[PDB]
Amino acid sequence: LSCPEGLEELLSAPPPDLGAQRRHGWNPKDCSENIEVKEGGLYFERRPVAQSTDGARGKRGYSRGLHAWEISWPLEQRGTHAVVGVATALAPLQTDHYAALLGSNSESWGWDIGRGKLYHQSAPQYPAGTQGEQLEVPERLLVVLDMEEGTLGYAIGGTYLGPAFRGLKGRTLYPAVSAVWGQCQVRIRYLGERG
């Protein structure tokens, strides 16, 4: 079990209420001009814009403890580049072409849930020693940020897939995605903190 200490307890707790999910949800003040944050942070909608990759950060950056949130991203709303992970407050959230914007720099770490590749200033396959064409990330995935070990990993159907990224200790990291699909609806559900 490569699971962060306390992940089972965090997931077994009463989930954060709607207020908390909104406080830790997408930031309307920290997203691409082509993204509209909906329901006070619970999801965003990318506007139908040609030749654009558009990202969003969570309202809250984490520097300590164990944090987890579920992303819900419908399979038919992913297009060519659907990347899920974290960013510093300095990651660019918009570019004028279709690309894996999340993880294309020093300020972001992303899992391409289409191709299964890991991007940081960039790619290895995740999970460990799988083939991309041989995997399909379902609609809901858990993002697991352990700021005690300085790790980012993912869980699918409540199974942790191990650490995707290491070396994160001493950073302040925000939930993030970058998207290319017009009118995609990407849900974030904060599941809480331990610590």
How would you characterize the overall build of this protein?
It is classed as protein binding. The entry lists the keywords E3 ubiquitin ligase, spsb2, protein binding. This protein is mainly beta and 195 residues long. The protein has one domain (1-195). Helix content is 6%, strand content 39%. The strands form 2 sheets. Strands 1, 4, 6, 7, 8, 9 and 13 form a 7-stranded antiparallel sheet that branches. The longest helix has 6 residues, at 7-12.
In percent, how much strand structure appears in the residues?
Answer: 35-45%
Encode the helix/strand succession as letters. HHEEEEEEEEEEEEEE
Shape verdict: globular
Structural class: mainly beta
The helix content, as a percent range, equals: under 10%
* Oligomeric grouping of the chains: monomer
Number of discrete domains: 1
Radius of gyration: 15 Å
How many β-strands, per DSSP?
Answer: 14
Report how far the terminal alpha carbons are from each other. Answer: 20 Å
The number of helical elements comes to 2
What summary fits the major beta sheet?
7 strands, antiparallel
Subcellular location: Cytoplasm; Cytoplasm, Cytosol
Organism: Homo sapiens (Human)
Keywords: Cytoplasm, Host-virus interaction, Ubl conjugation pathway
Family: Belongs to the SPSB family.
